[PDB]
Paper text:
While several DBL domains from different PfEMP1 proteins bind to CSA, VAR2CSA is the primary CSA receptor in placental malaria.
Indeed, the features proposed to form the CSPG-binding site of DBL3X, the sulfate-binding loop and the positively charged surface, are absent in DBL6ɛ, agreeing with a recent prediction based on molecular modeling. However, no clear additional density due to ligand could be observed after structure determination.
Numbering used by the authors: 2350 to 2539, 2547 to 2633
The structure:
Amino acid sequence: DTWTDLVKNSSDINKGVLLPPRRKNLFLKIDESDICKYKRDPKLFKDFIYSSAISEVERLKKVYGEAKTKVVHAMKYSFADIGSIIKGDDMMENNSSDKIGKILGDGVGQNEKRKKWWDMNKYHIWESMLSGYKHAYGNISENDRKMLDIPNNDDEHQFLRWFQEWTENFCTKRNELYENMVTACNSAKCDKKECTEACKNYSNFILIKKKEYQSLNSQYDMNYKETKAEKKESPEYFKDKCNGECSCLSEYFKDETRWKNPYETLDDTEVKNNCMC
């Protein structure tokens, strides 16, 4: 559930990069034992990568359960991450990316061999994940398939995807918790009954994510905004990239780092006093 800093080179060029729970939970481990089983037998390695993609879709249903949109959206992230794992771009520490490099006949810090392997399997890896989705929900709907298109995340910088995911998940939870804060109190001018419990939860949440964002935005500004993120600002870029569910970052936190007061980010002026009593 937490956004850990278990990333590669986090003291160096990856300072402030946070690792998504979804990615931490993406099981894809190669042991140094099976380094030869996969090298001499190219299609055995394939069946393992395909089934790792399979199991990932099976894991996602266990988490989100009957939330079709919430599972499909994560598939596209996990799919892309497998690409990063394969290509060597991945940022997690014990990702066994070193072992994959040797298996695909590249090794010693190269890219060409393992880059072409991904390029040749992207389609079939995704096709597996589609069969995994079908095994999870029964029948693939005739109008559901538009969501389940072959996704374009593979070439996009990983941190940018990870940050986008953070922001989406942040805005979804922030909105969810701000909704419970209204269905707990409408007027309570002052101590009343249950309202403050939600106020503590919303405030706590904003303050957990405050630190996380400060860490993620530290990396963004240093590297990715400077070269090519369309030179847009941190909250400004996600405002036009991932639809309207990353706008809450700009809509409530752009003008100033007003994270310092979590109650100031409330559009309704009525409920603001019950939490700030």
